[PDB]
Amino acid sequence: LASIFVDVSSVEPGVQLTVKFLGKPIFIRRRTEADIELGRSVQLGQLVDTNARNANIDAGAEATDQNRTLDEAGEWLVMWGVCTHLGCVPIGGVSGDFGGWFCPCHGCHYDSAGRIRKGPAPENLPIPLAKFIDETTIQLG
Ligand code: FES
């Protein structure tokens, strides 16, 4: 009975909703068209971490943009808001050098798919068990 159910019906493009789950923040960002295009423009060979870090799919999956979102359209990016270096909360709203998140504790920069691009963090922000259960609700867990 750990699962929770998040109403995302009012989340507009370019907005991140932050919810607490298992004691930690989950970021739910409805990505803009720029975020999506930029995420899909990155080659796997450019990435620090090529693993999708995604609980919903094979653990060996590649960190393509398509393997980082809940939907095929790429609008819904759901991830743990927990820096993979030492666990600080990354700052969003298109922050840092790669149009995503910036962790100010030791300067890690994540891209528009939450992938690590610069700084001490070793891994992409992990993606929780998450799925839409209708048009307006994401089940986490
Ligand atoms: S905790 Fe994020 S850069 Fe160190």
Side-chain angles (χ1 to χ4, degrees), residues 2-141:
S3 300
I4 63 168
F5 302 88
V6 184
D7 179 0
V8 298
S9 65
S10 294
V11 184
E12 298 277 9
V15 176
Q16 178 183 304
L17 180 55
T18 301
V19 302
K20 186 169 180 178
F21 181 54
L22 309 180
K24 299 177 190 192
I26 287 191
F27 296 170
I28 299 167
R29 180 176 174 86
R30 191 172 177 190
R31 299 200 301 166
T32 70
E33 301 303 338
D35 292 332
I36 299 171
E37 178 180 334
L38 291 174
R40 293 177 174 188
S41 298
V42 184
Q43 296 167 2
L44 285 175
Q46 295 175 257
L47 299 173
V48 169
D49 176 12
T50 58
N51 188 282
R53 307 294 171 195
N54 185 340
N56 303 288
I57 62 177
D58 188 82
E62 299 169 329
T64 61
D65 189 86
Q66 293 85 349
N67 283 345
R68 296 284 299 167
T69 60
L70 299 194
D71 59 325
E72 293 187 341
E75 297 190 47
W76 295 100
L77 178 63
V78 179
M79 58 203 178
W80 289 104
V82 180
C83 181
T84 65
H85 179 230
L86 292 173
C88 287
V89 178
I91 306 303
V94 196
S95 289
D97 296 346
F98 296 83
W101 288 259
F102 176 69
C103 183
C105 293
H106 320 89
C108 292
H109 297 66
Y110 300 86
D111 72 14
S112 72
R115 296 173 298 200
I116 183 63
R117 307 296 296 280
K118 185 188 165 195
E123 294 181 13
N124 302 326
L125 296 172
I127 295 163
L129 292 168
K131 70 176 323 185
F132 279 88
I133 62 156
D134 52 34
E135 293 173 357
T136 57
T137 303
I138 299 173
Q139 174 180 350
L140 301 174

mmCIF file of all heavy atoms in Angstrom, residues 35-69:
data_model
loop_
_atom_site.group_PDB
_atom_site.id
_atom_site.type_symbol
_atom_site.label_atom_id
_atom_site.label_comp_id
_atom_site.label_asym_id
_atom_site.label_seq_id
_atom_site.Cartn_x
_atom_site.Cartn_y
_atom_site.Cartn_z
ATOM 1 N N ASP A 35 12.533 21.756 -24.269
ATOM 2 C CA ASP A 35 13.116 20.725 -23.401
ATOM 3 C C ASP A 35 13.181 19.384 -24.135
ATOM 4 O O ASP A 35 14.163 18.646 -24.046
ATOM 5 C CB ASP A 35 12.254 20.479 -22.155
ATOM 6 C CG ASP A 35 12.210 21.640 -21.175
ATOM 7 O OD1 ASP A 35 13.169 22.444 -21.083
ATOM 8 O OD2 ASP A 35 11.184 21.699 -20.449
ATOM 9 N N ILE A 36 12.075 19.041 -24.794
ATOM 10 C CA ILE A 36 11.943 17.750 -25.474
ATOM 11 C C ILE A 36 12.914 17.654 -26.646
ATOM 12 O O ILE A 36 13.672 16.688 -26.753
ATOM 13 C CB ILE A 36 10.487 17.526 -25.947
ATOM 14 C CG1 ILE A 36 9.534 17.517 -24.747
ATOM 15 C CG2 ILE A 36 10.369 16.216 -26.715
ATOM 16 C CD1 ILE A 36 8.084 17.514 -25.143
ATOM 17 N N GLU A 37 12.905 18.669 -27.511
ATOM 18 C CA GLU A 37 13.810 18.674 -28.658
ATOM 19 C C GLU A 37 15.263 18.610 -28.215
ATOM 20 O O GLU A 37 16.057 17.842 -28.773
ATOM 21 C CB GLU A 37 13.600 19.912 -29.524
ATOM 22 C CG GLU A 37 14.576 19.940 -30.699
ATOM 23 C CD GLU A 37 14.397 21.147 -31.590
ATOM 24 O OE1 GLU A 37 13.272 21.690 -31.617
ATOM 25 O OE2 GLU A 37 15.387 21.535 -32.265
ATOM 26 N N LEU A 38 15.621 19.407 -27.211
ATOM 27 C CA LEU A 38 17.004 19.413 -26.739
ATOM 28 C C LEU A 38 17.402 18.054 -26.170
ATOM 29 O O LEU A 38 18.487 17.538 -26.482
ATOM 30 C CB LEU A 38 17.251 20.558 -25.751
ATOM 31 C CG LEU A 38 17.192 21.952 -26.414
ATOM 32 C CD1 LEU A 38 17.295 23.050 -25.369
ATOM 33 C CD2 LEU A 38 18.233 22.155 -27.520
ATOM 34 N N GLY A 39 16.513 17.435 -25.386
ATOM 35 C CA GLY A 39 16.797 16.093 -24.861
ATOM 36 C C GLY A 39 17.041 15.085 -25.972
ATOM 37 O O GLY A 39 17.918 14.232 -25.864
ATOM 38 N N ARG A 40 16.280 15.201 -27.056
ATOM 39 C CA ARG A 40 16.363 14.242 -28.155
ATOM 40 C C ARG A 40 17.506 14.536 -29.112
ATOM 41 O O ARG A 40 17.761 13.743 -30.021
ATOM 42 C CB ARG A 40 15.028 14.184 -28.890
ATOM 43 C CG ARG A 40 13.981 13.579 -27.982
ATOM 44 C CD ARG A 40 12.619 13.540 -28.553
ATOM 45 N NE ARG A 40 11.740 12.812 -27.634
ATOM 46 C CZ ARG A 40 10.494 12.463 -27.932
ATOM 47 N NH1 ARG A 40 9.977 12.788 -29.111
ATOM 48 N NH2 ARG A 40 9.756 11.815 -27.039
ATOM 49 N N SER A 41 18.189 15.656 -28.895
ATOM 50 C CA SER A 41 19.333 16.054 -29.729
ATOM 51 C C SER A 41 20.674 15.535 -29.224
ATOM 52 O O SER A 41 21.688 15.675 -29.906
ATOM 53 C CB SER A 41 19.388 17.576 -29.840
ATOM 54 O OG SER A 41 18.217 18.059 -30.463
ATOM 55 N N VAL A 42 20.683 14.948 -28.032
ATOM 56 C CA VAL A 42 21.924 14.482 -27.405
ATOM 57 C C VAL A 42 22.227 13.062 -27.879
ATOM 58 O O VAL A 42 21.349 12.199 -27.883
ATOM 59 C CB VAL A 42 21.814 14.525 -25.850
ATOM 60 C CG1 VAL A 42 23.134 14.136 -25.174
ATOM 61 C CG2 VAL A 42 21.381 15.910 -25.380
ATOM 62 N N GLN A 43 23.472 12.830 -28.277
ATOM 63 C CA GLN A 43 23.934 11.488 -28.630
ATOM 64 C C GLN A 43 24.367 10.726 -27.376
ATOM 65 O O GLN A 43 24.917 11.320 -26.447
ATOM 66 C CB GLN A 43 25.114 11.583 -29.601
ATOM 67 C CG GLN A 43 24.746 12.210 -30.945
ATOM 68 C CD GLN A 43 25.955 12.601 -31.783
ATOM 69 O OE1 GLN A 43 27.106 12.378 -31.397
ATOM 70 N NE2 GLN A 43 25.694 13.194 -32.942
ATOM 71 N N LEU A 44 24.124 9.416 -27.348
ATOM 72 C CA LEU A 44 24.527 8.597 -26.194
ATOM 73 C C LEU A 44 26.008 8.778 -25.860
ATOM 74 O O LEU A 44 26.389 8.850 -24.692
ATOM 75 C CB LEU A 44 24.202 7.118 -26.410
ATOM 76 C CG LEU A 44 22.737 6.695 -26.295
ATOM 77 C CD1 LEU A 44 22.586 5.240 -26.660
ATOM 78 C CD2 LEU A 44 22.199 6.936 -24.875
ATOM 79 N N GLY A 45 26.839 8.890 -26.894
ATOM 80 C CA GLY A 45 28.281 9.087 -26.708
ATOM 81 C C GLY A 45 28.694 10.368 -26.005
ATOM 82 O O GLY A 45 29.841 10.500 -25.568
ATOM 83 N N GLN A 46 27.769 11.317 -25.891
ATOM 84 C CA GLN A 46 28.028 12.574 -25.204
ATOM 85 C C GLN A 46 27.768 12.479 -23.704
ATOM 86 O O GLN A 46 28.178 13.361 -22.953
ATOM 87 C CB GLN A 46 27.146 13.702 -25.751
ATOM 88 C CG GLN A 46 27.367 14.118 -27.187
ATOM 89 C CD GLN A 46 26.336 15.159 -27.628
ATOM 90 O OE1 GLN A 46 25.389 14.843 -28.345
ATOM 91 N NE2 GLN A 46 26.508 16.400 -27.175
ATOM 92 N N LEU A 47 27.067 11.433 -23.274
ATOM 93 C CA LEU A 47 26.612 11.342 -21.886
ATOM 94 C C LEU A 47 27.645 10.795 -20.906
ATOM 95 O O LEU A 47 28.411 9.888 -21.234
ATOM 96 C CB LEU A 47 25.368 10.462 -21.801
ATOM 97 C CG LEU A 47 24.139 10.916 -22.578
ATOM 98 C CD1 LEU A 47 23.102 9.814 -22.480
ATOM 99 C CD2 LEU A 47 23.596 12.250 -22.032
ATOM 100 N N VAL A 48 27.641 11.335 -19.693
ATOM 101 C CA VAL A 48 28.458 10.802 -18.605
ATOM 102 C C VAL A 48 27.946 9.411 -18.206
ATOM 103 O O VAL A 48 28.734 8.476 -18.009
ATOM 104 C CB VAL A 48 28.449 11.757 -17.385
ATOM 105 C CG1 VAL A 48 29.068 11.102 -16.157
ATOM 106 C CG2 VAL A 48 29.170 13.052 -17.719
ATOM 107 N N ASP A 49 26.623 9.275 -18.104
ATOM 108 C CA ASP A 49 25.994 8.025 -17.681
ATOM 109 C C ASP A 49 25.025 7.569 -18.766
ATOM 110 O O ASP A 49 24.002 8.208 -18.995
ATOM 111 C CB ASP A 49 25.255 8.264 -16.350
ATOM 112 C CG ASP A 49 24.467 7.036 -15.859
ATOM 113 O OD1 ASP A 49 24.653 5.921 -16.398
ATOM 114 O OD2 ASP A 49 23.654 7.200 -14.908
ATOM 115 N N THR A 50 25.340 6.465 -19.437
ATOM 116 C CA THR A 50 24.493 5.977 -20.527
ATOM 117 C C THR A 50 23.359 5.050 -20.084
ATOM 118 O O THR A 50 22.616 4.559 -20.929
ATOM 119 C CB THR A 50 25.320 5.246 -21.608
ATOM 120 O OG1 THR A 50 26.030 4.158 -21.002
ATOM 121 C CG2 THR A 50 26.300 6.216 -22.261
ATOM 122 N N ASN A 51 23.225 4.799 -18.782
ATOM 123 C CA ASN A 51 22.150 3.934 -18.279
ATOM 124 C C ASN A 51 20.904 4.757 -17.971
ATOM 125 O O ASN A 51 21.005 5.826 -17.361
ATOM 126 C CB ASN A 51 22.630 3.198 -17.018
ATOM 127 C CG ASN A 51 21.649 2.138 -16.555
ATOM 128 O OD1 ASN A 51 20.619 2.441 -15.944
ATOM 129 N ND2 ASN A 51 21.967 0.888 -16.837
ATOM 130 N N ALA A 52 19.728 4.259 -18.365
ATOM 131 C CA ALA A 52 18.471 5.008 -18.149
ATOM 132 C C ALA A 52 18.107 5.240 -16.681
ATOM 133 O O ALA A 52 17.328 6.152 -16.386
ATOM 134 C CB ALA A 52 17.307 4.339 -18.868
ATOM 135 N N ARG A 53 18.642 4.415 -15.774
ATOM 136 C CA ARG A 53 18.340 4.519 -14.333
ATOM 137 C C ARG A 53 16.820 4.568 -14.089
ATOM 138 O O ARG A 53 16.330 5.332 -13.238
ATOM 139 C CB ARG A 53 19.022 5.744 -13.703
ATOM 140 C CG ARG A 53 20.532 5.864 -13.947
ATOM 141 C CD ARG A 53 21.351 4.752 -13.273
ATOM 142 N NE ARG A 53 22.734 4.834 -13.749
ATOM 143 C CZ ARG A 53 23.647 3.880 -13.613
ATOM 144 N NH1 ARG A 53 23.345 2.743 -12.994
ATOM 145 N NH2 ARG A 53 24.872 4.060 -14.114
ATOM 146 N N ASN A 54 16.085 3.734 -14.822
ATOM 147 C CA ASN A 54 14.620 3.826 -14.878
ATOM 148 C C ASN A 54 13.984 2.545 -14.347
ATOM 149 O O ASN A 54 14.107 1.487 -14.959
ATOM 150 C CB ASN A 54 14.205 4.114 -16.336
ATOM 151 C CG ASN A 54 12.718 4.351 -16.498
ATOM 152 O OD1 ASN A 54 11.910 3.956 -15.645
ATOM 153 N ND2 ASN A 54 12.344 5.021 -17.602
ATOM 154 N N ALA A 55 13.294 2.658 -13.207
ATOM 155 C CA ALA A 55 12.667 1.512 -12.528
ATOM 156 C C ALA A 55 11.616 0.802 -13.362
ATOM 157 O O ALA A 55 11.286 -0.345 -13.074
ATOM 158 C CB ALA A 55 12.038 1.976 -11.226
ATOM 159 N N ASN A 56 11.084 1.487 -14.375
ATOM 160 C CA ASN A 56 9.946 0.988 -15.169
ATOM 161 C C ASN A 56 10.316 0.106 -16.341
ATOM 162 O O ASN A 56 9.440 -0.511 -16.942
ATOM 163 C CB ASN A 56 9.126 2.167 -15.676
ATOM 164 C CG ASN A 56 8.642 3.039 -14.545
ATOM 165 O OD1 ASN A 56 7.757 2.638 -13.793
ATOM 166 N ND2 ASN A 56 9.239 4.220 -14.393
ATOM 167 N N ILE A 57 11.607 0.061 -16.661
ATOM 168 C CA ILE A 57 12.069 -0.636 -17.855
ATOM 169 C C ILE A 57 13.317 -1.449 -17.538
ATOM 170 O O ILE A 57 13.793 -1.439 -16.409
ATOM 171 C CB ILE A 57 12.302 0.345 -19.039
ATOM 172 C CG1 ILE A 57 13.402 1.374 -18.718
ATOM 173 C CG2 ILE A 57 10.990 1.033 -19.440
ATOM 174 C CD1 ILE A 57 13.741 2.336 -19.861
ATOM 175 N N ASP A 58 13.837 -2.158 -18.536
ATOM 176 C CA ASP A 58 14.999 -3.004 -18.305
ATOM 177 C C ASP A 58 16.142 -2.209 -17.667
ATOM 178 O O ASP A 58 16.418 -1.075 -18.058
ATOM 179 C CB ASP A 58 15.467 -3.653 -19.606
ATOM 180 C CG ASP A 58 16.552 -4.680 -19.365
ATOM 181 O OD1 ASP A 58 16.213 -5.839 -19.005
ATOM 182 O OD2 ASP A 58 17.737 -4.321 -19.508
ATOM 183 N N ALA A 59 16.806 -2.818 -16.689
ATOM 184 C CA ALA A 59 17.857 -2.132 -15.941
ATOM 185 C C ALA A 59 19.093 -1.841 -16.786
ATOM 186 O O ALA A 59 19.946 -1.063 -16.380
ATOM 187 C CB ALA A 59 18.217 -2.907 -14.673
ATOM 188 N N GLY A 60 19.188 -2.477 -17.951
ATOM 189 C CA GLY A 60 20.285 -2.221 -18.879
ATOM 190 C C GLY A 60 19.938 -1.222 -19.972
ATOM 191 O O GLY A 60 20.741 -0.985 -20.872
ATOM 192 N N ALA A 61 18.759 -0.606 -19.889
ATOM 193 C CA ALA A 61 18.316 0.296 -20.945
ATOM 194 C C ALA A 61 19.228 1.517 -21.092
ATOM 195 O O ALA A 61 19.779 2.025 -20.110
ATOM 196 C CB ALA A 61 16.875 0.731 -20.694
ATOM 197 N N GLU A 62 19.369 1.989 -22.326
ATOM 198 C CA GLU A 62 20.163 3.186 -22.614
ATOM 199 C C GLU A 62 19.407 4.458 -22.253
ATOM 200 O O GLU A 62 18.180 4.522 -22.390
ATOM 201 C CB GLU A 62 20.511 3.247 -24.101
ATOM 202 C CG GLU A 62 21.338 2.077 -24.577
ATOM 203 C CD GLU A 62 21.449 2.015 -26.082
ATOM 204 O OE1 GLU A 62 20.504 2.444 -26.795
ATOM 205 O OE2 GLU A 62 22.496 1.533 -26.547
ATOM 206 N N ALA A 63 20.157 5.469 -21.827
ATOM 207 C CA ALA A 63 19.599 6.753 -21.409
ATOM 208 C C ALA A 63 19.211 7.669 -22.581
ATOM 209 O O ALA A 63 19.515 8.867 -22.578
ATOM 210 C CB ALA A 63 20.572 7.458 -20.465
ATOM 211 N N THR A 64 18.534 7.111 -23.581
ATOM 212 C CA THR A 64 17.921 7.935 -24.624
ATOM 213 C C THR A 64 16.812 8.768 -23.983
ATOM 214 O O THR A 64 16.274 8.394 -22.934
ATOM 215 C CB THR A 64 17.275 7.069 -25.713
ATOM 216 O OG1 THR A 64 16.237 6.263 -25.134
ATOM 217 C CG2 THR A 64 18.313 6.180 -26.398
ATOM 218 N N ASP A 65 16.467 9.895 -24.612
ATOM 219 C CA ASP A 65 15.374 10.725 -24.107
ATOM 220 C C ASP A 65 14.084 9.914 -23.942
ATOM 221 O O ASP A 65 13.370 10.063 -22.952
ATOM 222 C CB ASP A 65 15.145 11.919 -25.040
ATOM 223 C CG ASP A 65 14.185 12.939 -24.457
ATOM 224 O OD1 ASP A 65 14.641 13.825 -23.700
ATOM 225 O OD2 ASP A 65 12.979 12.850 -24.778
ATOM 226 N N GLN A 66 13.806 9.044 -24.908
ATOM 227 C CA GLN A 66 12.605 8.212 -24.906
ATOM 228 C C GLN A 66 12.544 7.240 -23.713
ATOM 229 O O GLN A 66 11.458 6.894 -23.230
ATOM 230 C CB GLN A 66 12.504 7.465 -26.245
ATOM 231 C CG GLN A 66 12.245 8.390 -27.463
ATOM 232 C CD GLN A 66 13.491 9.030 -28.118
ATOM 233 O OE1 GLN A 66 14.619 8.989 -27.598
ATOM 234 N NE2 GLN A 66 13.268 9.641 -29.282
ATOM 235 N N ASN A 67 13.708 6.804 -23.242
ATOM 236 C CA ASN A 67 13.794 5.944 -22.064
ATOM 237 C C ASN A 67 13.849 6.716 -20.744
ATOM 238 O O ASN A 67 14.053 6.117 -19.691
ATOM 239 C CB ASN A 67 14.999 5.013 -22.188
ATOM 240 C CG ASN A 67 14.743 3.858 -23.145
ATOM 241 O OD1 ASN A 67 13.593 3.578 -23.516
ATOM 242 N ND2 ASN A 67 15.810 3.180 -23.550
ATOM 243 N N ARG A 68 13.666 8.035 -20.804
ATOM 244 C CA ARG A 68 13.670 8.863 -19.603
ATOM 245 C C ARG A 68 12.310 9.450 -19.238
ATOM 246 O O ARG A 68 12.170 10.029 -18.174
ATOM 247 C CB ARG A 68 14.713 9.989 -19.722
ATOM 248 C CG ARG A 68 16.177 9.511 -19.827
ATOM 249 C CD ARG A 68 16.736 9.042 -18.477
ATOM 250 N NE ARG A 68 16.718 10.143 -17.508
ATOM 251 C CZ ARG A 68 16.906 10.000 -16.197
ATOM 252 N NH1 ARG A 68 17.157 8.805 -15.649
ATOM 253 N NH2 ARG A 68 16.846 11.066 -15.417
ATOM 254 N N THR A 69 11.315 9.299 -20.108
ATOM 255 C CA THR A 69 9.985 9.875 -19.872
ATOM 256 C C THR A 69 8.931 8.785 -19.749
ATOM 257 O O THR A 69 9.142 7.658 -20.193
ATOM 258 C CB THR A 69 9.569 10.884 -20.980
ATOM 259 O OG1 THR A 69 9.543 10.224 -22.245
ATOM 260 C CG2 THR A 69 10.545 12.057 -21.051
#
